[PDB]
Design a protein around this ligand. Sequence first.
Ligand SMILES: OC[C@H]1O[C@@H](O)[C@H](O)[C@@H](O)[C@@H]1O
Ligand SMILES: OC[C@H]1O[C@@H](O)[C@H](O)[C@@H](O)[C@@H]1O
Ligand SMILES: OC[C@H]1O[C@@H](O)[C@H](O)[C@@H](O)[C@@H]1O
Ligand SMILES: OC[C@H]1O[C@@H](O)[C@H](O)[C@@H](O)[C@@H]1O
Ligand SMILES: [K+]
Ligand SMILES: [K+]
Ligand SMILES: [K+]
Ligand SMILES: [K+]
Ligand SMILES: [Zn+2]
Ligand SMILES: [Zn+2]
Ligand SMILES: [Zn+2]
Ligand SMILES: [Zn+2]
Lengths: 312, 312, 312, 312
Amino acid sequence: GLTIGVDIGGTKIAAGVVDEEGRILSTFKVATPPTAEGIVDAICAAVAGASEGHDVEAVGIGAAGYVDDKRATVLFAPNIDWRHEPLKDKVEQRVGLPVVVENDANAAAWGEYRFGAGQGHDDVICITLGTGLGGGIIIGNKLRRGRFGVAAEFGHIRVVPDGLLCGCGSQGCWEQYASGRALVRYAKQRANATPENAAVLLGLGDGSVDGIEGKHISEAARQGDPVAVDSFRELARWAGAGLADLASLFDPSAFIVGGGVSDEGELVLDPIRKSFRRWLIGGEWRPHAQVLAAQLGGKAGLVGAADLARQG
Amino acid sequence: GLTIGVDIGGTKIAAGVVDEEGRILSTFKVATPPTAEGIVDAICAAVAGASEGHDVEAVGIGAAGYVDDKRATVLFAPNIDWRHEPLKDKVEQRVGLPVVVENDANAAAWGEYRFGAGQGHDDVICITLGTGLGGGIIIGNKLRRGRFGVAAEFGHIRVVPDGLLCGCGSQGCWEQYASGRALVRYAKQRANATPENAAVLLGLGDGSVDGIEGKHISEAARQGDPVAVDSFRELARWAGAGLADLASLFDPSAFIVGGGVSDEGELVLDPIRKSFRRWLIGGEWRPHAQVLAAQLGGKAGLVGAADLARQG
Amino acid sequence: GLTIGVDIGGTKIAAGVVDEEGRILSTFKVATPPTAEGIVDAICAAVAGASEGHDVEAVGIGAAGYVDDKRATVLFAPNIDWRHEPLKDKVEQRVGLPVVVENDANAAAWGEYRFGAGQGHDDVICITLGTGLGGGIIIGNKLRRGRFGVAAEFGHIRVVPDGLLCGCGSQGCWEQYASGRALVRYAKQRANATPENAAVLLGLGDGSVDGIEGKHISEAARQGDPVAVDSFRELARWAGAGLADLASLFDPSAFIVGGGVSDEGELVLDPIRKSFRRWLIGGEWRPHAQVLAAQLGGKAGLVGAADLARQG
Amino acid sequence: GLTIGVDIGGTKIAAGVVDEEGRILSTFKVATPPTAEGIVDAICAAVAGASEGHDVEAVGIGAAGYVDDKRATVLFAPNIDWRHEPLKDKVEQRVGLPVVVENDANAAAWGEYRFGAGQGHDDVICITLGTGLGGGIIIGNKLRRGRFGVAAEFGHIRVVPDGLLCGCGSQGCWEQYASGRALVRYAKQRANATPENAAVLLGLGDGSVDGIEGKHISEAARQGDPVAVDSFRELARWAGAGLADLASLFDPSAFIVGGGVSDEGELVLDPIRKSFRRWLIGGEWRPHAQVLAAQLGGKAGLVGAADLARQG
Ligand SMILES: OC[C@H]1O[C@@H](O)[C@H](O)[C@@H](O)[C@@H]1O
Ligand SMILES: OC[C@H]1O[C@@H](O)[C@H](O)[C@@H](O)[C@@H]1O
Ligand SMILES: OC[C@H]1O[C@@H](O)[C@H](O)[C@@H](O)[C@@H]1O
Ligand SMILES: OC[C@H]1O[C@@H](O)[C@H](O)[C@@H](O)[C@@H]1O
Ligand SMILES: [K+]
Ligand SMILES: [K+]
Ligand SMILES: [K+]
Ligand SMILES: [K+]
Ligand SMILES: [Zn+2]
Ligand SMILES: [Zn+2]
Ligand SMILES: [Zn+2]
Ligand SMILES: [Zn+2]
């Protein structure tokens, strides 16, 4: 039957009724409140708005952060003051339907695997290059959350010893080098070096280096703005090298690369592929994983969380 | 019934008859020949010597390097001139029993999982710190070789961007920092800096920095030789940080740490655990994997390869 | 004749009358105000208090940050909102004596060279390991400020590509790894990993990892607190490696190592020397610079700034 | 009067008679012998051939490696089996003229300073990007060799902790990332990743990745060969970042960038300048050193060594 998926974003919370083929029949969005306590009411309002006129059987919620193996508790969220938050219990009490809580990128990975670019593969690794960096693991046709629920924290593998401080509390995390926030750092540092090579980029914002935002960088790079282009290339080197490490770890059939950074398309995916090939160990002797574009865009987590709510 | 496991080492090739409980009933060793072509005859002689007086049903061979998903072909070996070597076919033709070929550290991981420190866990990651660095993945009670057979090449994940050249052809591999060869580099660099702090260490060899070997370092560290101790501590920082990254990737119940480097025991395992805890992301909020000592020692690959020969 | 030296610190501003032999005859301290504009009045009050009863001929002011080659303008200060601040002019107008403005670590280097550990050498490099990391260059018996006044910004050479964000605006600076702030980071990360090994350290503060301060670390390490000791050793590796790079650049007779971090004495200087020796390139073939303890302590900048006020 | 300069290269030894204006009046080249003992006879034959028809007063010899402060002994050479080699004595005995021995890049720096791009500056840092990476320091109009003769070993400052093994015996040296040998590594790694983007480059050699040589890379990049271009850009990032560190150390009026790598001209110098600007700490507040093209090409060391033979 029909289930609801919920995507908890930094700015908006979206809930959608999703059918068994992963099709979204309704979508209702609410503002993400500044408060943790408010976020629960907002999730419930989003679910109510999406649910109108549909026979809904379960609710799946995708949340950034470490979710336990019981798919019930957010152990830690990077942008919400949730610490061992019993989200499943609180929402079930309020909506009166079964609820599953999943990591956001796990949910997106399952969405891409079941309904997107992963179809036809048995073993795939999905990566989301967004504001944060996440991913999900599919092995033998099943999402793998690990013993304690916290597998596929790809954003927090250390790629630079003694590197940048990260929101997770550690240093040198992949997310500090291959996420949208890294993209903005590269553009700012490059625009500061040579502002004449960033005319288009700076024109799209307020004209200062401080004013550069992620949205500007994609549009400027498309136009051939040298700083914006070079910034994507710098990000692509980190993203491709990290995929190469994941190939040595998991050796999947395919990688599915998604998230806001990947949205510009081949401008960023092509250099990611080139770096993957450069750093793939034993690439002369072993088969190369396919590096595939995600197909569901920003809807992958909503669809995936709804479908994960069925498995149970 | 009984099967034979084969361990192909840099100096010796050992074959052993192994029962269903993982018990080794016979062991026959032959010198590893300098030639690739010779290695096949030697494998066959080792199998014949071990097999005498036992009803053997199958042969499992563990080999360093990338083994395909058909468990038949060595795609690349780091110390043997094998490139797409059809090892299974060549040995089956000669011994007249079914043969499986597995990566050496996959075999050791399966041995530890089935008969050693992994018993009672469903999801474990095994690491071998030896001359090279390898490992194996157990997820949902099954060894995971990946789509193309080449998963768990842990030694070749990049831990240092722009780092040391590695035998795999790449740079900055974990094996360059956490293997026995790294241990020797640290000891040499430290003994060169302060030879007065390496009296015991240098006394165990020929007295020169060039003469320092791995065997010396373990014995000297035990005696409290400062250089030898500090060298293990340096290796332990890399080994523990790498385990922390693997926890973010796989989130297993336990890590099993084995190989020649780990043989000294708590002298090295305790600092590995301390570094693991230091670098475990979200360690305040998530459960900590157990870091367990391997139980089968150098016999794990032989036992594991024999048992893998049953599954089929 | 007599001159006054001024040390502008984060908490206190000290002025002292200094004779031709570098002897401090009077010292007057004032609180560092929270405001940039206030800092000028405070400098003048400190000078007035120190000057009472002495015939003072000139004033030398040591300031953290980039000072121009005219020894007049603070181009940028890391802890004061000074940007192209005409400090010399403002103070001369108010005190009615000639004023020179020098970088703080340049002043300390000249103090150590003329009156401290540098006496008898012609070519010495001084390093200050304090809250920030600074230094000074003496070549052919003269302080070398560079063409634009900004030489010997040792704290901001990049030792880690893609490393930690620094207060200077860049990444991977030596100051992020070898200063007192790095010491505190290492202790916190280590105390978080193994709080049982930091009992003494945590007892000296409020008992939490957050409460660990620099002062605690020195006292705990002295007592053999493992975390505190290991934290100094980690800092010493960065400090010694950086000295080794400076030897390849400047090849001085001696390094003089001072600042608050170095105050514990051989506990930190001995490991710094060991790391220097480890990383000194061509150390087998070339003479080794002496690594000397500073002699003037926290008074070096005051004495040096007073004496620099004479040269002119 | 007239002096002779000698350049000891990996393939050829060149000697030239040089006038007081740095003009080369004669040049005689001899093959560099495979043997250290032979190199002395060859130096003498080169001097004799160049000297014919000129009244020569002194001989200056530039040698790669660490030269002592007496300008007499090669303490260590990276490509010749010289260890504490009394080169001055051996040559003086044979040629019967005063001889000075200087580091090769010191000699080139003095040549550029006196007769090339350094004229009009008082404080300049010269860098040579060739097969090896070297440089020289001019401060207050004088070459600075340091206390023991071994200053300005720029090639062996550590830019990557735990980085590539270097011929000097250490790790992570700037020479491993910004020299001609690094250029070749980048091109090979990139051509391996995407051989279709290296058609022109591979066509210039034997068609294999192994066949790629430095000469090919310059010519291919000029034609817009993507791999060759990207390889120069990768080198330029390391070269520019290193210049930025040197600006924090020495704060010179100008950098003079020379050597074989720089010969292609603005194709490489422009990206070096862009990276310099990106990484220059405090670049918003301090004056920027000029980054200048060398003017004397491969003749700088010969001219500089001849002129250094006058000062004495
Ligand atoms: O939101 C994308 C990712 O952000 C990371 O910082 C979090 O640790 C992940 O749990 C999440 O999947
Ligand atoms: O022998 C231990 C390990 O050595 C590594 O260098 C190889 O790549 C692995 O396949 C092997 O498992
Ligand atoms: O105060 C010590 C040092 O701190 C550094 O951060 C500043 O850049 C230097 O100018 C100063 O000498
Ligand atoms: O030849 C250029 C440079 O090569 C480096 O490897 C040597 O250490 C230097 O002494 C020399 O100046
Ligand atoms: K995940
Ligand atoms: K493996
Ligand atoms: K300074
Ligand atoms: K030099
Ligand atoms: Zn992180
Ligand atoms: Zn490798
Ligand atoms: Zn800095
Ligand atoms: Zn080197």
